[PDB]
């Protein structure tokens, strides 16, 4: 409908204004108190912090510049911040401030206290089809938004979907997101979610995000991913074969949708045909979904996470607490000039 076309035209205008003129240097470290480490990786961490004057809580992602350089993540880190400061959609975590110092890069996000979808899925075992469909619809609308801005996301997996106080999704971690008109070539993503054309080192496109949506829906409704194996080389063999076995408890509509998203030939894959996202939105599995009501957050969620307040960390786990050190000498200044 023209109403959807005009919504996406405005969304792209607002994105491009911030993309061309990015905000920089909008807070500093000593404006915040550190509370707890919420998760950790190769070159970065995420910490719960509290702003000292307003009392608001935030999730602060901290990247060590020297480690970003050594793990060959310069361009990816610059993509992450420039995209996050320019987007705006109900199911994306919001960036509130960004800054750098002699040692680190910082992205300060709104804190979502309900935890990762991954924790809730593994607790309960699997989601019913209605529960999986409520989350899937939010991912379909978010990919329709991002792809209309020429953005590929490239990191869909249950750990990157946080559950908010209303039981809706907020997508976090734009470390592999990129603005792409046409093809791109980098190997990135978690093994169980990789499309065949990434494994085979091709020039690939936004169709890899619709493949990853098929893996996510399968894992939500089964409890485990479709190409599961003990080591990556065996996972990759299963993916490129694309043979998939479905549990008997899956509906016939779910099986049919998943055969069309987990299509090895990217030129035949739902989301990547002449009708684009509408082949997914009009599929029988989504017949009960009110797309407008989902966007407006008017549907009652299947599940509300248990937590005590905006500073509660009980839905996240425990990590060794390490210093946030800042050198007296500036490191890697040239590489990160635009941040």
Curated annotation (Swiss-Prot):
Membrane topology recorded in Swiss-Prot or TrEMBL: Lipid-anchor
Keywords for the protein's UniProt record, in alphabetical order: ATP-binding, cAMP, Cell membrane, Cytoplasm, Kinase, Lipoprotein, Membrane, Mitochondrion, Myristate, Nucleotide-binding, Nucleus, Phosphoprotein, Serine/threonine-protein kinase, Transferase
Reported tissue expression: Ubiquitously expressed in mammalian tissues.
Record-annotated Protein kinase domain positions: 32-286
PTM field: Autophosphorylated. Phosphorylation is enhanced by vitamin K(2). Phosphorylated on threonine and serine residues. Phosphorylation on Thr-186 is required for full activity. Phosphorylated at Tyr-319 by activated receptor tyrosine kinases EGFR and PDGFR; this increases catalytic efficiency.
Source superkingdom: Eukaryota
Family per similarity comment: Belongs to the protein kinase superfamily. AGC Ser/Thr protein kinase family. cAMP subfamily.
Inhibition and activation profile: Allosterically activated by various compounds, including ATP. Activated by cAMP; the nucleotide acts as a dynamic and allosteric activator by coupling the two lobes of apo PKA, enhancing the enzyme dynamics synchronously and priming it for catalysis.
Entry's Gene Ontology molecular function annotations: ATP binding; cAMP-dependent protein kinase activity; magnesium ion binding; manganese ion binding; protein domain specific binding; protein kinase A regulatory subunit binding; protein kinase binding; protein serine kinase activity
Binding partners and assembly: A number of inactive tetrameric holoenzymes are produced by the combination of homo- or heterodimers of the different regulatory subunits associated with two catalytic subunits. cAMP causes the dissociation of the inactive holoenzyme into a dimer of regulatory subunits bound to four cAMP and two free monomeric catalytic subunits. Activates cAMP-sensitive PKAI and PKAII holoenzymes by interacting with regulatory subunit (R) of PKA, PRKAR1A/PKR1 and PRKAR2A/PKR2, respectively. Interacts with NFKB1, NFKB2 and NFKBIA in platelets; these interactions are disrupted by thrombin and collagen.
SS bond partners: none
Identification of the protein by name: cAMP-dependent protein kinase catalytic subunit alpha
Catalyzed reactions: L-seryl-[protein] + ATP = O-phospho-L-seryl-[protein] + ADP + H(+); L-threonyl-[protein] + ATP = O-phospho-L-threonyl-[protein] + ADP + H(+)
Name of the coding gene: PRKACA
Chain positions found as Phosphothreonine: 37, 184, 186
Modified sites of kind Phosphoserine: 128, 327
InterPro entries assigned: AGC-kinase_C, Kinase-like_dom_sf, Prot_kinase_dom, Protein_kinase_ATP_BS, Ser/Thr_kinase_AS, STKc_PKA
Purpose of the protein: Phosphorylates a large number of substrates in the cytoplasm and the nucleus. Phosphorylates CDC25B, ABL1, NFKB1, CLDN3, PSMC5/RPT6, PJA2, RYR2, RORA, SOX9 and VASP. Regulates the abundance of compartmentalized pools of its regulatory subunits through phosphorylation of PJA2 which binds and ubiquitinates these subunits, leading to their subsequent proteolysis. RORA is activated by phosphorylation. Required for glucose-mediated adipogenic differentiation increase and osteogenic differentiation inhibition from osteoblasts. Involved in chondrogenesis by mediating phosphorylation of SOX9.
Lineage, opening ranks: Eukaryota, Metazoa, Chordata, Craniata, Vertebrata
CDD domains per the UniProt record, alphabetical: STKc_PKA (cd14209)
A Gene Ontology BP annotation from the UniProt entry: neural tube closure
Entry binding sites for ATP: 38-46, 61, 110-116, 157-160
């Amino acid at each position: 409908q023209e109403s959807v076309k005009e919504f996406l035209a405005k969304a792209k205008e607002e994105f491009l204004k911030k993309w061309e003129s990015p905000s920089q240097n909008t807070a500093q470290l000593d404006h915040f108190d550190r509370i707890k480490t919420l998760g950790t990786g190769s070159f970065g961490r995420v910490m719960l912090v509290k702003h000292k004057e307003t009392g608001n809580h935030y999730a602060m992602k901290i990247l060590d510049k020297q480690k970003v350089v050594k793990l060959k993540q310069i361009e990816h880190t610059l993509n992450e911040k420039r995209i996050l400061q320019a987007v705006n959609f109900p199911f994306l975590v919001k960036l509130e401030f960004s800054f750098k110092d002699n040692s680190n890069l910082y992205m300060v996000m709104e804190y979502v206290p309900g935890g990762e979808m991954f924790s809730h899925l593994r607790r309960i075992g699997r989601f019913s089809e209605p529960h999986a469909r409520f989350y899937a619809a939010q991912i379909v609308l978010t990919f329709e938004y991002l792809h209309s801005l020429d953005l590929i996301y490239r990191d869909l997996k249950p750990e990157n979907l946080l559950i908010d106080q209303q039981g809706y999704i907020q997508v976090t971690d734009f470390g592999f997101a990129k603005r792409v008109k046409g093809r791109t070539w980098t190997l990135c993503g978690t093994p169980e979610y990789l499309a065949p054309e990434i494994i085979l080192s091709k020039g690939y496109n936004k169709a890899v995000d619709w493949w990853a949506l098929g893996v996510l829906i399968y894992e939500m409704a089964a409890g485990y991913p479709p190409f599961f194996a003990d080591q990556p080389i065996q996972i990759y063999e299963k993916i490129v074969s694309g043979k998939v076995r479905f549990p008997s408890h899956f509906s016939s509509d779910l099986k049919d949708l998943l055969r069309n998203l987990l299509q090895v030939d990217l030129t035949k894959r739902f989301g990547n045909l002449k009708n684009g996202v509408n082949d997914i939105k009009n599929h029988k599995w989504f017949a009960t979904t009110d797309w407008i009501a989902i966007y407006q957050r008017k549907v009652e969620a299947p599940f509300i996470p248990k937590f005590k307040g905006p500073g509660d960390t009980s839905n996240f786990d425990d990590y060794e607490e390490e210093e946030i050190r800042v050198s007296i000498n500036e490191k890697c200044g040239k590489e990160f000039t635009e941040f």
